[PDB]
From a paper:
MBTD1130–566 crystallized in the orthorhombic space group P212121 (a = 70.31 Å, b = 100.90 Å, c = 135.30 Å) with two molecules in the asymmetric unit. In the MBTD1 structure, each molecule contains four MBT repeats that exhibit irregular rhomboid architecture. A narrow channel runs through the middle of the structure and is filled with water molecules. Consistent with previously reported MBT repeat structures, each MBT repeat contains an extended “arm” which packs against a globular β subunit core of the preceding repeat. The residues involved in intermolecular hydrogen bond interactions between the two molecules in the asymmetric unit are conserved throughout the whole MBT repeat family, possibly implying that MBTD1 functions as a dimer unit. Although the four MBT repeats of MBTD1 have similar three-dimensional structures and high sequence identity, only the fourth MBT repeat (MBT4) contains the semi-aromatic cage, which is formed by the loops between the first and second strands and the third and fourth strands of the β- barrel core domain and constitutes the binding site for methyllysine residue, analogous to L3MBTL2. The binding pocket of the MBTD1-MBT4 is shown in Figure 4, where an open cage in MBTD1 is formed by aromatic residues Phe526, Trp529, Tyr533, negatively charged Asp502, and Leu508. The arginine residue 325 is stabilized by a salt bridge with the pocket residue Asp502, and cation-π and van der Waals and interactions with the aromatic cage residues.
MBTD1, Malignant Brain Tumor domain-containing protein 1, is one such PcG protein. MBTD1 is a four MBT repeat protein comprising 628 amino acids. It contains a FCS-type zinc finger at the N-terminus with putative regulatory function and four MBT repeats at the C-terminus. The MBT (Malignant Brain Tumor) repeat is a structural motif of ∼100 amino acids that is conserved from C. elegans to humans and exists as tandem repeats.
Residue numbers in the entry: 12 to 56, 61 to 223, 233 to 295, 297 to 432
Write the structure that this text describes.
């Protein structure tokens, strides 16, 4: 399985790296494009020649050695953030030889002349590109750093986890009181699920050579004024079910915490309080009553609720409750860049260990429907467009993470 062949067999389109602000180089890609030329090794000949970008898919570039024109006989895919890609001028700056592919060595006669003619004015890689690449992959979370994280088996409490590995900004955490042999939690270092040691007590969230994580390293949460009209216990809303990212569910505000966090319960599936999960009020995972109907999204009603189809108006009268007002959910919709059909590499939020060949299949504003290629649609997930659990084609190869293929 190659992303290159997959994308070529089917003329697929990859989300540009630019859609993923949290990924390596997600902020430094603005001048990468088709017909950028680079210096890369000449495999047809230890030495280098010029290649132009025929096709760009996430981090992956389809390159054609200069002098080939429309002949794709030796086009080859590679990772533009990989270690043998250099800007035009790198050989000359290092005193290295530019040597033509054996295949077109006789196609043109005057090579120096030919390179002045082709490269004069050429777009190439930003300067400092290779330093920026290399800074990109230097993550601030280290092994042995302790964090607070949601308890997989008891969502309403945090427990303490320790970073055992970093791969590509993703952390494999291990619970400090492990309850089985292989007792990890995989998440991005910008996950909204991890917090400084002392977070739970500070905010009123329940809780069950290592050192505390420097509090400054955590993703910043948007500041909210919760002192006028706010959420209040018993208000209804819709919420992506944390145990089932395929579904948006009928839900209720169960606790209003400090700093804007909310304990939310899925009606029909609530124990004691142990199933409450914590979303920030600005979370893209909760929506007002009506969101689903107005947008043609399957709303999942409470377990055991028989009067179908579900009607909110009836459920409000029955449970004697009100909708959280729509204004409480206002938030920007970034111009995220994603388009239906777009390929990318996604985390399977039901088994986060796995990162998978995937496609965006619906966009409702900032909300994406993510499909895992080759698998059942039933298991498509709802994910925000700024999720830190989405990545560009090539990210696995770049960081050394194992990629699951389709099907």
């Amino acid at each position: 399985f190659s992303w290159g062949n997959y994308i070529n067999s089917n003329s697929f389109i990859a989300a540009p790296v630019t859609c993923f602000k949290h990924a390596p180089m997600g902020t430094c890609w603005g001048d990468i494009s088709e017909n950028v030329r680079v210096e890369v090794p000449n495999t047809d000949c230890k030495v280098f020649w010029i290649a132009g970008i025929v096709k760009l898919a996430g981090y992956n570039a389809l390159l054609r050695y200069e002098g080939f024109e429309n002949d794709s006989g030796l086009d080859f895919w590679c990772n533009i953030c990989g270690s043998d890609i250099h800007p035009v001028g790198w050989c000359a700056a290092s005193g290295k030889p530019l040597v033509p592919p054996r295949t077109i060595q006789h196609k043109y006669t005057n090579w120096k002349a030919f390179l002045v003619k082709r490269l004069t004015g050429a777009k190439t890689l930003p300067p400092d590109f290779s330093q920026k690449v290399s800074e990109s992959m230097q993550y601030p979370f280290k092994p042995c750093m302790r964090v607070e994280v949601v308890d997989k088996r008891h969502l309403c409490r945090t427990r303490v986890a320790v970073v055992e590995s970093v791969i590509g900004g993703r952390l494999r955490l291990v619970y400090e009181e492990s309850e089985d042999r292989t007792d990890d939690f995989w998440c991005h270092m910008h996950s909204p699920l991890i917090h400084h040691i002392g977070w739970s007590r500070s905010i009123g969230h329940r809780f069950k050579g290592h050192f505390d994580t420097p509090p400054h390293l955590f993703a910043k949460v948007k500041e909210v004024d919760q002192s006028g009209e706010w959420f209040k216990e018993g208000m209804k809303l819709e919420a992506i079910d944390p145990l089932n990212l395929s579904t948006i569910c009928v839900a209720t505000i169960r606790k209003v915490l400090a700093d804007g966090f909310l304990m939310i319960g899925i009606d029909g599936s609530e124990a004691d309080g142990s199933d409450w999960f914590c979303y920030h009020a600005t979370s893209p995972s909760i929506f007002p009553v009506g969101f689903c109907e107005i947008n043609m999204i399957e709303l999942t009603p409470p377990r055991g609720y028989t009067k179908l189809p579900f009607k909110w108006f009836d459920y409000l009268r029955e449970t004697g409750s009100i909708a959280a007002p729509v204004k409480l959910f206002n938030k920007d919709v970034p111009n995220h860049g994603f388009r239906v059909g777009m390929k990318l590499e996604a985390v399977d939020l039901m088994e986060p260990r796995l990162i998978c060949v995937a496609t965006v299949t619906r966009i409702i504003h900032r909300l994406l429907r993510i499909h895992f290629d080759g698998w059942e649609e039933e298991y498509d997930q709802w994910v925000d467009c700024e999720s830190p659990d989405l990545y560009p084609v090539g990210w696995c190869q770049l960081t050394g993470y194992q990629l699951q293929p389709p099907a």
